[model samples]
Target chain A: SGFRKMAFPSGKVEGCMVQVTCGTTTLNGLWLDDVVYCPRHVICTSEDMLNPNYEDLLIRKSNHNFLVQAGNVQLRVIGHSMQNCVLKLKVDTANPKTPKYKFVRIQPGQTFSVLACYNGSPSGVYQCAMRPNFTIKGSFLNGSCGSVGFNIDYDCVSFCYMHHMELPTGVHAGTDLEGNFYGPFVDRQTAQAAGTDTTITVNVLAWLYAAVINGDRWFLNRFTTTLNDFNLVAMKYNYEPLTQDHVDILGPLSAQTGIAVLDMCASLKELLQNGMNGRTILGSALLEDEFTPFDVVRQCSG
Target chain B: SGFRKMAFPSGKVEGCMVQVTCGTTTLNGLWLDDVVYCPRHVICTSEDMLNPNYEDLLIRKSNHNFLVQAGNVQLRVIGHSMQNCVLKLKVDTANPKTPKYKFVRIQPGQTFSVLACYNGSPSGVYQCAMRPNFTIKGSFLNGSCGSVGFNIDYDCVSFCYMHHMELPTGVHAGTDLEGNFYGPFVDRQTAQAAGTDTTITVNVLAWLYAAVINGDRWFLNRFTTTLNDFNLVAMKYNYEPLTQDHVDILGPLSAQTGIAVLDMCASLKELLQNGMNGRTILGSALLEDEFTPFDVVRQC
Candidate 1:
């Protein structure tokens, strides 16, 4: 759960904290100006535990703002001792004027979510914020999550990778001249050069296309996953593994496919590390929960 | 991938090893005589990584004989160098005397499985063995998996838990004054007292019934899993989470119901530890693969 890392009490409901679940596990959440920033997410039957140990978790991710980088997700609150956190949340991924979310009192155990972004993030690779009108649940007196209601710099931040250039942060996988992490990297080596933590995600589809084009048996056998698995984090068009469109993107650039050959057998020891490895390198979150898909596309929220 | 654990390359094909996938992961394998002993297992749509790191894997397992414990599964081979190991496997779970597995040469990528045991294990809880007539896949050489053809110890050793008492091993969740390991333990406290490794499996069905009967909110929130997920490891007919029959088994033992309240959030860090924690404590293997079910039952 991202309760410890993603959630920030910051006096949001006195002792209450917030969380968001994404991509089979809980990603970091950003509570800025009372607005909740989490992954705009969206899966399968009888899912399992995600990062059981969370070893491959964002151990070093300093930014809690980029919670839901991709996929359909859920949100809830946890009380440090009591359930005093009362709040309301709604879709802020887009919409230029009238405020949609009305101030409502939320109690512990209650979950809130906006059914947007599953089609594709409306705000592109930007923060999807939730402006919360907060108050103490039981107290007759009212108070904002912070000094005032959540001052949403942006109503929300959302992400989608429709093509090669559609990255949340940068054109490249790692840190460029600008010092921030961005990915769905081209390959493990380039991702490695960017630092282990910097390679938040991998352009697994690109590598997969190359693998099929190049007939890399090892990659084909172990990493030849299904589209349903691929669709969890990557909502790309023409990037479907078993289609002609996916072939066109990396078919010609097979040499520069930017792939890594891993002995997943060798990389075995803990669950989350492998799951993290799977999700980061392949856009396939390993050992995470399994759920039915919501067809999180990467076209455009519009 | 229990290539190192569930598979035994004891000259089975001169250079081939055997494997069987079970319960979202691979269990240990045994190649006693010429028969293969692995978990008779099987699942889901697009599954994620299993024990990506395999932290909760049998880090200290000493036996390679009792491979499959439960569930429907698949089998494959791995070569030391090349695709030399060729063999065929068939359902040896039950039958009076006829040898079902014909001595067909299998290739490296060949996968074999029997559709039996989905209803329930027929041989009860025992070691299910596969007698393999091995040979060098390339050369015109003939040999058994071992010195001779796999000596049929028993076609298979299957498991079923129709009730709380039926187990592959003893009555209790842990060892019953014996040296062997056994479980589907009644609760985590009993499982914990038996040492970490000894608690190979948990009677998650029992705990879930207890959680519902006693209103354990902590477990209910984090672990109110579905029947299909539960069926991956447990195939108890009456033990279905939402059924009245399930309630009867553990409902009466609400006070003595063995359960360990886990702050699953506290039990989070790496994927496998939590997954392992889940599988061991709740009979739920976390972070394992996701697949469809085949109605595994635990009735007599």
Candidate 2:
């Protein structure tokens, strides 16, 4: 849930806040989110608590935003907390016109910071929900604060790999999680250099071609780890994997590919430093000769 | 690819005292009873290698059967040697049932078994290749070997809880890796002992009732460490979290509820374990005040 700020007295119900209380026993591990409650309502904040000692939760306030790391925690909240709360969200990637703000409600009191990129048609009213059981719901309010709506920058990004410029350079044939139709990277050089190794045999080459044509770049990335680091992040978020086209052409060259073999989330942090020099170097680059043709398919938007 | 054995000059062919010159690669990896290809046909071994290496692959008339262990070996037969070569195989986990073997052909002085488990899938007439890409060609015999076949076992299990039972026994349910479901272990006394110290409320009762009806015995086990361990191994596979059913008789207890407190999987494991242990303690003649409805619901 996101940090909720509100005055004790409501002037016009600009936003909502929820106060979670326990019954007889302490309510330790419960999560409350802002929701719209109607059919096709979007859900946000989806916060969760750890194995909260039941006693401590009896009289606690959930007014702060918390991370609901996947597979880590689960909890429950009392009352219809998801219907009334609204959260403000910002998107850091790609902006053209004025900045946009989106509203999300977890309940009457709970709200969350929205970061997800939405995709749907016309954008009249979109809905997002929680996983497994899609119970929580919310709506996408239109027209920047109920005024004139803003025009969209390019609605879709292009990524094409046409042989003879029949398609524009940026226009992609299709998208896969491995970045785009041209492969994981945003450019060509990166994809080819990642898969330039002996491990890729002719048969493997044939297999890769089939994968690209079949749009199996996601499976390909999982199978080979072409752009090890980038793909790891992508895979973590259910994105596509590297393709074969990436290996033979872009693999052998890029520094990013090298960094990926090390699983560095952020080079500055060096979070995975070991006892030795905090820098470990395996003899040869792991995928030096392990290229396959399937590493260059495009990526899909999540 | 196990060890192989072969006999010379048998009733299957003519020529008895055939002198066969086999390559050193043929005997290098050959072991007893493993199937090997003599250039002419398929053959098996009868015993261990008397002289193991790539050097002694050719046949020199011997009073007794020749034992061989060829590392990086291949099998070959020449002249009447085709009549004497024998073929045998050893069975183990690595080598299961499918891919039945076909007839073998031995050319004069031709050899096999040089590299273990050579790719030999029939592609065309009189032609075969080894694996990762062991595609056979032509129309060869498919009697003995192509691809091995095997079978797997399967099962299904379910749990049910009636609203009017009035019993205090707690039940559990979980699934395993292969997506198989298991259990509803009921603990009578532990179900009644849970939530006693806390103030009684409709929601609290409703929560316990909902979990019990859904066979969430694992959740009950989450009360402590001992119960957690038991529940962890009880259902050894991936299981979707449990959901409750709507029962008219059970007014407030019918909502499908979930907890955001414990890690989902961990919570489920620990809770079930708690159910198992609590029920065990309550079931035993030890504890006195372990028969409350809350306690019984805890067992469920």
Off by over 4 Å in 2: A1-302, B1-30, B33-300
In order of appearance, the predictions have TM-scores of: 0.16, 0.16
lDDT per residue as tens, model 2, B1-300: 000011110111110001112222122111112232222111222122322221133344331232232322322311223222222222121222122222332211111111011122111111011111111111111121211111111111111110100112121111111112212311111232212121112222333443344443433434322324433443343221222211222232333344322233344344333433323221121111112222223222
Whole-model Cα lDDT per candidate?
0.22, 0.21
DockQ versus reference, model 1: 0.01
Candidate 1 residue-wise lDDT, B1-300, digit = tens: 000001110111211123333334432233222334332211111132221222222222223322333233432222111011111123334222223222332211111121111112210011111111111111000110111112111232112111111122111111111111233233111222222221101223333332233333333334433334443423322221223333343333433433322222122212222233322322233221111010001100
lDDT of 1 by residue, A228-261 (tens): 4443423332221223333343333443333322
Per-candidate DockQ versus the true complex?
Answer: 0.01, 0.01
- What digit string (tens of lDDT, one per residue) describes model 2 on residues A1-302? 00001001110011111111122111111111222111001121112121222223322434222211111222132222321111121112121221222322121111111111111111111111111111112222221111111111122111111110001221111111111222222221122222211122222232333323323232222222234554455444333344544344433322323323212222211211221131221111111111222121111000
Model 1 lDDT, residue A21, Cα:
41
